[PDB]
Amino acid sequence: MFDIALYEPEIAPNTGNIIRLCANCGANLHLIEPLGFDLDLARVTRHKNYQAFLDYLEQRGEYRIFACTTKTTGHHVDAQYRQGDVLLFGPETRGLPMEVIESLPMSQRIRIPMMPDARSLNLSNAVAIIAFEAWRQLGFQGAKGH
Amino acid sequence: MFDIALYEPEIAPNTGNIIRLCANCGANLHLIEPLGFDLDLARVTRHKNYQAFLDYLEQRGEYRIFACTTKTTGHHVDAQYRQGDVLLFGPETRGLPMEVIESLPMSQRIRIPMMPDARSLNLSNAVAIIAFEAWRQLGFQGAKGH
């Protein structure tokens, strides 16, 4: 239904959790280099840089990049997901650069609700939250017993 | 709006992630002993056993225990959450015992959708998924800018 992309991921254990998460919801995982670690992987694709990631997507049919950012008023539930959507996340401590975020329509910028004075989410929990909202809107197509 | 409870949690790093997660959605965290590790914590309460956990809840107004289990046809989106609900999770590798699950109405037993042949979810990702679905149904009451 959709894919997950990590921009320059930093913490290997998080990328480990996100690989398992991708198997549970049927997503393939895109890692945009450079990684903060050295690197089952049958659903994992590495891209040299953001532009190479875009060049790879153009050849593979319909897509939209939804960027996880605090720099928006729209939450992950307000977006309307479609087959081919890609859920993009920056490093846990830095988020995505402005040149990536500003390349996207305002409606493809999504923030996860949070209480005032809370710490950032663990990246893998943020992926799980957005991935399961996309999958909900797509009727959990592919789920066991469904 | 709601609280999270871990039955005999095993892996400390997961409990760490779930503490941060609880701060993001405004939940308090209940740990039902024994823990698999020795143990900010201002929102964390330890209970000697399941019955002590129930004795603590009875004195603190309206509640329902929703148990995360594969032993149900109903998914986390089919449940209708209310203020006072408690989201209960067993250890990642064992899940909850039958004597806990069977004490609950069938509508308080929830499973997260998953692809056939996927590994179990990391516990903290399963908590994030159910916690953010409850919070969605409760209008993300308390969220920044909301």
mmCIF file of C-alpha atoms in Angstrom:
data_model
loop_
_atom_site.group_PDB
_atom_site.id
_atom_site.type_symbol
_atom_site.label_atom_id
_atom_site.label_comp_id
_atom_site.label_asym_id
_atom_site.label_seq_id
_atom_site.Cartn_x
_atom_site.Cartn_y
_atom_site.Cartn_z
ATOM 1 C CA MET A 1 0.000 0.000 0.000
ATOM 2 C CA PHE A 2 2.706 2.487 1.034
ATOM 3 C CA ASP A 3 6.477 2.637 1.771
ATOM 4 C CA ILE A 4 8.562 4.155 4.591
ATOM 5 C CA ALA A 5 11.701 6.262 3.992
ATOM 6 C CA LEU A 6 14.340 7.297 6.613
ATOM 7 C CA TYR A 7 16.501 10.360 5.724
ATOM 8 C CA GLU A 8 20.075 9.832 7.081
ATOM 9 C CA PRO A 9 18.959 7.583 10.000
ATOM 10 C CA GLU A 10 21.317 7.807 13.094
ATOM 11 C CA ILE A 11 20.458 5.005 15.661
ATOM 12 C CA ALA A 12 20.703 1.372 14.328
ATOM 13 C CA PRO A 13 18.302 -0.183 16.936
ATOM 14 C CA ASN A 14 15.525 2.206 15.672
ATOM 15 C CA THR A 15 16.155 1.111 12.026
ATOM 16 C CA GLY A 16 15.943 -2.516 13.315
ATOM 17 C CA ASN A 17 12.531 -1.863 14.916
ATOM 18 C CA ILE A 18 11.305 -0.035 11.732
ATOM 19 C CA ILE A 19 12.320 -3.096 9.545
ATOM 20 C CA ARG A 20 10.067 -5.359 11.737
ATOM 21 C CA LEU A 21 7.362 -2.661 11.656
ATOM 22 C CA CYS A 22 7.519 -2.569 7.796
ATOM 23 C CA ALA A 23 6.922 -6.394 7.678
ATOM 24 C CA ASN A 24 3.806 -6.021 9.940
ATOM 25 C CA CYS A 25 2.116 -3.432 7.619
ATOM 26 C CA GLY A 26 3.459 -4.608 4.224
ATOM 27 C CA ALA A 27 5.656 -1.483 3.599
ATOM 28 C CA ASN A 28 9.106 -1.537 1.923
ATOM 29 C CA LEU A 29 11.872 0.522 3.692
ATOM 30 C CA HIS A 30 14.020 3.184 1.905
ATOM 31 C CA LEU A 31 17.261 4.365 3.652
ATOM 32 C CA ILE A 32 18.658 7.670 2.268
ATOM 33 C CA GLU A 33 22.481 7.828 2.807
ATOM 34 C CA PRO A 34 24.581 8.707 4.620
ATOM 35 C CA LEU A 35 23.564 6.355 7.506
ATOM 36 C CA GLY A 36 24.930 6.953 11.067
ATOM 37 C CA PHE A 37 25.775 3.174 11.254
ATOM 38 C CA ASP A 38 27.090 0.306 9.013
ATOM 39 C CA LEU A 39 24.376 -2.050 7.529
ATOM 40 C CA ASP A 40 15.133 -9.472 6.471
ATOM 41 C CA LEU A 41 16.841 -6.703 4.323
ATOM 42 C CA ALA A 42 14.788 -8.179 1.335
ATOM 43 C CA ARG A 43 12.400 -5.165 1.656
ATOM 44 C CA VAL A 44 15.249 -2.572 2.312
ATOM 45 C CA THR A 45 16.663 -0.267 -0.454
ATOM 46 C CA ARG A 46 19.588 2.208 0.037
ATOM 47 C CA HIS A 47 19.692 5.496 -1.974
ATOM 48 C CA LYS A 48 22.934 7.594 -2.404
ATOM 49 C CA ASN A 49 20.993 10.836 -1.706
ATOM 50 C CA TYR A 50 17.516 12.460 -1.781
ATOM 51 C CA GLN A 51 17.640 13.151 -5.570
ATOM 52 C CA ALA A 52 18.553 9.447 -6.280
ATOM 53 C CA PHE A 53 15.558 8.466 -4.031
ATOM 54 C CA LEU A 54 13.274 10.722 -6.179
ATOM 55 C CA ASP A 55 14.853 9.289 -9.416
ATOM 56 C CA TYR A 56 14.062 5.720 -8.129
ATOM 57 C CA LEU A 57 10.373 6.660 -7.287
ATOM 58 C CA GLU A 58 9.658 8.354 -10.710
ATOM 59 C CA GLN A 59 10.243 5.004 -12.505
ATOM 60 C CA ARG A 60 7.957 3.062 -10.072
ATOM 61 C CA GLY A 61 4.532 4.614 -10.744
ATOM 62 C CA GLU A 62 2.300 6.881 -8.598
ATOM 63 C CA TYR A 63 3.771 8.328 -5.375
ATOM 64 C CA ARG A 64 3.557 11.229 -2.915
ATOM 65 C CA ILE A 65 6.169 12.032 -0.221
ATOM 66 C CA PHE A 66 4.556 12.814 3.200
ATOM 67 C CA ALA A 67 7.201 14.407 5.470
ATOM 68 C CA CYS A 68 6.946 13.989 9.285
ATOM 69 C CA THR A 69 7.616 17.566 10.617
ATOM 70 C CA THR A 70 6.490 19.886 13.483
ATOM 71 C CA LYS A 71 6.472 22.751 10.847
ATOM 72 C CA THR A 72 2.789 22.340 9.876
ATOM 73 C CA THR A 73 -0.736 22.767 11.359
ATOM 74 C CA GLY A 74 -1.992 19.480 9.760
ATOM 75 C CA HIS A 75 -1.781 16.192 11.728
ATOM 76 C CA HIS A 76 -1.219 12.651 10.360
ATOM 77 C CA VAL A 77 -5.066 11.973 10.510
ATOM 78 C CA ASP A 78 -5.913 15.083 8.318
ATOM 79 C CA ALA A 79 -3.832 13.741 5.358
ATOM 80 C CA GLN A 80 -5.728 11.403 2.950
ATOM 81 C CA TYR A 81 -3.311 8.554 1.992
ATOM 82 C CA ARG A 82 -3.364 6.628 -1.305
ATOM 83 C CA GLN A 83 -1.552 3.602 -2.697
ATOM 84 C CA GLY A 84 2.056 4.612 -3.581
ATOM 85 C CA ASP A 85 2.432 7.130 -0.682
ATOM 86 C CA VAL A 86 5.882 7.259 0.971
ATOM 87 C CA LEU A 87 6.133 8.195 4.699
ATOM 88 C CA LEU A 88 9.443 10.143 5.108
ATOM 89 C CA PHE A 89 11.173 10.713 8.504
ATOM 90 C CA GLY A 90 14.382 12.553 9.368
ATOM 91 C CA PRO A 91 16.765 11.620 12.210
ATOM 92 C CA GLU A 92 15.154 11.605 15.683
ATOM 93 C CA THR A 93 17.252 14.530 17.054
ATOM 94 C CA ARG A 94 17.355 16.792 13.866
ATOM 95 C CA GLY A 95 14.229 16.071 11.725
ATOM 96 C CA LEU A 96 14.265 16.820 7.963
ATOM 97 C CA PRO A 97 16.106 19.706 6.349
ATOM 98 C CA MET A 98 14.182 22.789 5.126
ATOM 99 C CA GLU A 99 15.164 22.111 1.423
ATOM 100 C CA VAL A 100 13.308 18.708 1.618
ATOM 101 C CA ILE A 101 10.240 19.984 3.578
ATOM 102 C CA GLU A 102 9.771 23.123 1.419
ATOM 103 C CA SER A 103 9.894 20.971 -1.832
ATOM 104 C CA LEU A 104 6.507 19.451 -0.791
ATOM 105 C CA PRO A 105 2.943 20.772 -0.884
ATOM 106 C CA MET A 106 1.723 21.978 2.567
ATOM 107 C CA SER A 107 -0.829 19.042 2.656
ATOM 108 C CA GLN A 108 2.112 16.487 2.466
ATOM 109 C CA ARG A 109 3.672 17.934 5.684
ATOM 110 C CA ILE A 110 2.311 16.065 8.720
ATOM 111 C CA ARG A 111 2.836 16.445 12.468
ATOM 112 C CA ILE A 112 1.867 13.907 15.151
ATOM 113 C CA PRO A 113 -0.157 15.453 18.037
ATOM 114 C CA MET A 114 1.725 15.803 21.355
ATOM 115 C CA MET A 115 1.190 17.215 24.874
ATOM 116 C CA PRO A 116 2.986 20.528 25.663
ATOM 117 C CA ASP A 117 6.474 19.961 27.287
ATOM 118 C CA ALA A 118 6.745 16.306 26.033
ATOM 119 C CA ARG A 119 10.156 15.062 24.666
ATOM 120 C CA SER A 120 10.314 14.081 20.908
ATOM 121 C CA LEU A 121 8.904 10.564 20.133
ATOM 122 C CA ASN A 122 11.278 7.652 19.653
ATOM 123 C CA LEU A 123 11.511 7.552 15.794
ATOM 124 C CA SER A 124 10.210 3.934 15.497
ATOM 125 C CA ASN A 125 7.062 4.894 17.581
ATOM 126 C CA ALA A 126 6.492 7.924 15.265
ATOM 127 C CA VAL A 127 6.801 5.562 12.205
ATOM 128 C CA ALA A 128 4.352 3.039 13.783
ATOM 129 C CA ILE A 129 1.801 5.854 14.488
ATOM 130 C CA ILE A 130 1.865 7.318 10.955
ATOM 131 C CA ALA A 131 2.153 3.885 9.188
ATOM 132 C CA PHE A 132 -0.876 2.493 11.105
ATOM 133 C CA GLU A 133 -2.969 5.646 10.345
ATOM 134 C CA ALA A 134 -2.183 5.289 6.574
ATOM 135 C CA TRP A 135 -3.009 1.553 6.769
ATOM 136 C CA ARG A 136 -6.290 2.339 8.613
ATOM 137 C CA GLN A 137 -7.363 4.753 5.809
ATOM 138 C CA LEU A 138 -6.455 2.011 3.254
ATOM 139 C CA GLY A 139 -8.765 -0.510 5.116
ATOM 140 C CA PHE A 140 -5.733 -2.521 6.484
ATOM 141 C CA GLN A 141 -5.649 -4.206 3.021
ATOM 142 C CA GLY A 142 -3.509 -7.399 3.286
ATOM 143 C CA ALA A 143 -3.972 -7.979 7.084
ATOM 144 C CA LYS A 144 -4.446 -11.634 8.326
ATOM 145 C CA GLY A 145 -8.172 -12.621 8.645
ATOM 146 C CA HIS A 146 -9.198 -9.365 6.819
ATOM 147 C CA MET B 1 -7.727 10.584 28.904
ATOM 148 C CA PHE B 2 -6.433 7.018 29.335
ATOM 149 C CA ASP B 3 -3.575 5.079 31.025
ATOM 150 C CA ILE B 4 -1.173 2.350 29.848
ATOM 151 C CA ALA B 5 -0.415 -0.808 31.874
ATOM 152 C CA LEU B 6 2.446 -3.328 31.266
ATOM 153 C CA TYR B 7 1.958 -6.841 32.768
ATOM 154 C CA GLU B 8 5.367 -8.198 33.967
ATOM 155 C CA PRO B 9 7.410 -6.199 31.388
ATOM 156 C CA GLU B 10 10.737 -7.957 30.375
ATOM 157 C CA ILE B 11 12.982 -5.528 28.316
ATOM 158 C CA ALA B 12 13.959 -2.225 30.096
ATOM 159 C CA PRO B 13 14.659 -0.211 26.865
ATOM 160 C CA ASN B 14 10.999 -0.863 25.772
ATOM 161 C CA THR B 15 9.690 0.414 29.170
ATOM 162 C CA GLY B 16 11.955 3.488 28.633
ATOM 163 C CA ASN B 17 10.392 4.177 25.210
ATOM 164 C CA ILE B 18 6.837 3.639 26.644
ATOM 165 C CA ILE B 19 7.545 6.234 29.462
ATOM 166 C CA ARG B 20 8.407 8.873 26.760
ATOM 167 C CA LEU B 21 5.373 7.724 24.740
ATOM 168 C CA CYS B 22 3.093 8.205 27.823
ATOM 169 C CA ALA B 23 4.340 11.854 28.179
ATOM 170 C CA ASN B 24 3.498 12.549 24.467
ATOM 171 C CA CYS B 25 -0.179 11.409 24.823
ATOM 172 C CA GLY B 26 -0.831 12.398 28.472
ATOM 173 C CA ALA B 27 -1.163 8.769 29.779
ATOM 174 C CA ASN B 28 0.111 7.549 33.185
ATOM 175 C CA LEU B 29 2.082 4.212 33.151
ATOM 176 C CA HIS B 30 1.219 1.203 35.408
ATOM 177 C CA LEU B 31 3.881 -1.570 35.822
ATOM 178 C CA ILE B 32 2.481 -4.875 37.205
ATOM 179 C CA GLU B 33 5.251 -6.812 39.080
ATOM 180 C CA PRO B 34 7.338 -8.820 38.800
ATOM 181 C CA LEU B 35 9.472 -6.769 36.323
ATOM 182 C CA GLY B 36 12.263 -8.490 34.284
ATOM 183 C CA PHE B 37 14.621 -5.575 35.269
ATOM 184 C CA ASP B 38 15.408 -3.274 38.280
ATOM 185 C CA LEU B 39 13.778 0.254 38.173
ATOM 186 C CA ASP B 40 10.380 11.087 34.604
ATOM 187 C CA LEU B 41 8.961 8.240 36.857
ATOM 188 C CA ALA B 42 6.459 10.945 38.177
ATOM 189 C CA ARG B 43 3.736 9.310 35.985
ATOM 190 C CA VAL B 44 4.848 5.648 36.779
ATOM 191 C CA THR B 45 3.067 3.442 39.411
ATOM 192 C CA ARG B 46 4.181 -0.123 40.399
ATOM 193 C CA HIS B 47 1.560 -2.731 41.488
ATOM 194 C CA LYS B 48 2.491 -5.955 43.447
ATOM 195 C CA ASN B 49 0.189 -8.053 41.195
ATOM 196 C CA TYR B 50 -2.868 -7.914 38.878
ATOM 197 C CA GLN B 51 -5.393 -7.957 41.787
ATOM 198 C CA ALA B 52 -3.569 -4.991 43.499
ATOM 199 C CA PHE B 53 -3.733 -3.157 40.093
ATOM 200 C CA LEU B 54 -7.546 -3.769 40.009
ATOM 201 C CA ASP B 55 -7.832 -2.684 43.720
ATOM 202 C CA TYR B 56 -5.976 0.597 42.823
ATOM 203 C CA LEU B 57 -8.310 1.282 39.776
ATOM 204 C CA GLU B 58 -11.614 0.672 41.727
ATOM 205 C CA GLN B 59 -10.820 3.651 44.027
ATOM 206 C CA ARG B 60 -9.978 5.982 41.065
ATOM 207 C CA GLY B 61 -13.331 6.259 39.256
ATOM 208 C CA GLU B 62 -14.509 4.912 35.861
ATOM 209 C CA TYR B 63 -12.234 2.454 34.009
ATOM 210 C CA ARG B 64 -12.179 -0.404 31.491
ATOM 211 C CA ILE B 65 -9.187 -2.719 30.849
ATOM 212 C CA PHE B 66 -8.521 -3.245 27.082
ATOM 213 C CA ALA B 67 -6.118 -6.200 26.660
ATOM 214 C CA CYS B 68 -3.784 -6.344 23.606
ATOM 215 C CA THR B 69 -4.134 -10.006 22.391
ATOM 216 C CA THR B 70 -4.173 -12.013 19.099
ATOM 217 C CA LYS B 71 -7.065 -14.092 20.669
ATOM 218 C CA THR B 72 -9.891 -11.925 19.257
ATOM 219 C CA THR B 73 -11.498 -10.968 15.895
ATOM 220 C CA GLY B 74 -11.825 -7.253 16.915
ATOM 221 C CA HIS B 75 -9.022 -4.779 16.050
ATOM 222 C CA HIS B 76 -7.899 -1.692 18.035
ATOM 223 C CA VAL B 77 -10.033 0.600 15.695
ATOM 224 C CA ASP B 78 -13.310 -1.397 16.378
ATOM 225 C CA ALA B 79 -13.139 -0.663 20.162
ATOM 226 C CA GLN B 80 -14.800 2.635 21.267
ATOM 227 C CA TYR B 81 -12.520 4.216 23.945
ATOM 228 C CA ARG B 82 -13.693 6.473 26.793
ATOM 229 C CA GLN B 83 -11.995 8.552 29.471
ATOM 230 C CA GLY B 84 -10.611 6.195 32.182
ATOM 231 C CA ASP B 85 -9.730 3.338 29.743
ATOM 232 C CA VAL B 86 -6.518 1.412 30.530
ATOM 233 C CA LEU B 87 -4.509 -0.135 27.629
ATOM 234 C CA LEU B 88 -2.957 -3.394 29.000
ATOM 235 C CA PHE B 89 -0.015 -5.225 27.315
ATOM 236 C CA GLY B 90 1.796 -8.419 28.288
ATOM 237 C CA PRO B 91 5.504 -9.129 27.676
ATOM 238 C CA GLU B 92 6.559 -8.965 24.000
ATOM 239 C CA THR B 93 7.462 -12.699 23.728
ATOM 240 C CA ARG B 94 4.584 -14.213 25.900
ATOM 241 C CA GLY B 95 1.553 -11.830 25.787
ATOM 242 C CA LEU B 96 -1.042 -11.888 28.612
ATOM 243 C CA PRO B 97 -2.101 -14.986 30.512
ATOM 244 C CA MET B 98 -5.486 -16.637 29.791
ATOM 245 C CA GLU B 99 -6.784 -15.874 33.378
ATOM 246 C CA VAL B 100 -6.364 -12.083 32.658
ATOM 247 C CA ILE B 101 -7.762 -12.154 29.062
ATOM 248 C CA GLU B 102 -10.784 -14.351 29.944
ATOM 249 C CA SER B 103 -11.713 -11.981 32.899
ATOM 250 C CA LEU B 104 -12.628 -9.300 30.284
ATOM 251 C CA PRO B 105 -15.617 -8.854 27.977
ATOM 252 C CA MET B 106 -14.865 -9.933 24.355
ATOM 253 C CA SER B 107 -15.175 -6.225 23.218
ATOM 254 C CA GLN B 108 -12.214 -5.262 25.569
ATOM 255 C CA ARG B 109 -9.884 -7.759 23.775
ATOM 256 C CA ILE B 110 -8.101 -6.004 20.894
ATOM 257 C CA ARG B 111 -5.652 -7.186 18.235
ATOM 258 C CA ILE B 112 -3.525 -4.960 15.975
ATOM 259 C CA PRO B 113 -3.797 -5.888 12.249
ATOM 260 C CA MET B 114 -0.702 -7.580 10.753
ATOM 261 C CA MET B 115 0.450 -9.159 7.460
ATOM 262 C CA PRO B 116 0.628 -13.004 7.394
ATOM 263 C CA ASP B 117 4.159 -14.331 8.339
ATOM 264 C CA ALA B 118 5.211 -11.033 10.078
ATOM 265 C CA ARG B 119 7.179 -11.240 13.414
ATOM 266 C CA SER B 120 5.441 -9.833 16.594
ATOM 267 C CA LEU B 121 5.617 -5.983 16.917
ATOM 268 C CA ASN B 122 8.188 -4.406 19.208
ATOM 269 C CA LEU B 123 6.045 -3.790 22.367
ATOM 270 C CA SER B 124 6.627 0.022 22.401
ATOM 271 C CA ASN B 125 5.394 0.245 18.712
ATOM 272 C CA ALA B 126 2.259 -1.786 19.672
ATOM 273 C CA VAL B 127 1.661 0.653 22.627
ATOM 274 C CA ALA B 128 2.137 3.709 20.326
ATOM 275 C CA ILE B 129 -0.370 2.259 17.769
ATOM 276 C CA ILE B 130 -3.126 1.521 20.316
ATOM 277 C CA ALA B 131 -2.475 4.701 22.428
ATOM 278 C CA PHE B 132 -2.679 6.965 19.327
ATOM 279 C CA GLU B 133 -5.926 5.253 18.132
ATOM 280 C CA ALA B 134 -7.538 5.833 21.600
ATOM 281 C CA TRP B 135 -6.292 9.456 21.559
ATOM 282 C CA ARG B 136 -7.681 9.929 18.006
ATOM 283 C CA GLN B 137 -11.167 8.745 19.140
ATOM 284 C CA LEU B 138 -10.895 11.169 22.127
ATOM 285 C CA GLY B 139 -10.155 14.113 19.690
ATOM 286 C CA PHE B 140 -6.433 14.303 20.795
ATOM 287 C CA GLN B 141 -7.726 16.314 23.816
ATOM 288 C CA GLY B 142 -4.731 18.121 25.430
ATOM 289 C CA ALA B 143 -2.472 18.217 22.291
ATOM 290 C CA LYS B 144 -0.396 21.439 21.635
ATOM 291 C CA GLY B 145 -2.209 23.921 19.287
ATOM 292 C CA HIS B 146 -5.447 21.815 19.552
#
